Amino acid sequence: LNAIEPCVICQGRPKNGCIVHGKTGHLMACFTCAKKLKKRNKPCPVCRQPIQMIVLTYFP
């Protein structure tokens, strides 16, 4: 699974930065890297929809 691989962007942290759009979320980046995508106004790298928010996701 992709779930046990680290952030695709930095490969140094877990995939805990949820990219939220609508009623759906893409998990592929950590919170820090995912925040950077939103700041720099990038769309979701996966589905290319706009990023509504970044949620720090715990899986606990």
Binding site: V8, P14, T24, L27, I54, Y58, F59, P60
Partner: protein, 61 residues
């Protein structure tokens, strides 16, 4: 983390793809179906007891 690979902690037969969201944090321990049921019951997040503001279907990429 390895907990994401476990079945939903509630129904135990669907994957953990229901993010329960409160503010800018979320707890992902249930499936989408059970997370929505919790919100519909007006339950609070089962981990931290915060008001559930949003339930999201999560896809791991």
């Amino acid at each position: 983390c390895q907990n994401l690979l476990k079945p939903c902690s509630l129904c135990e037969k669907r994957p953990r793809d229901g993010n329960i969201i409160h503010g800018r944090t979320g707890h992902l321990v249930t499936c989408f179906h059970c997370a929505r049921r919790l919100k519909k019951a007006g339950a609070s997040c089962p981990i931290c007891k915060k008001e559930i503001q949003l339930v999201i279907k999560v896809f791991i990429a």
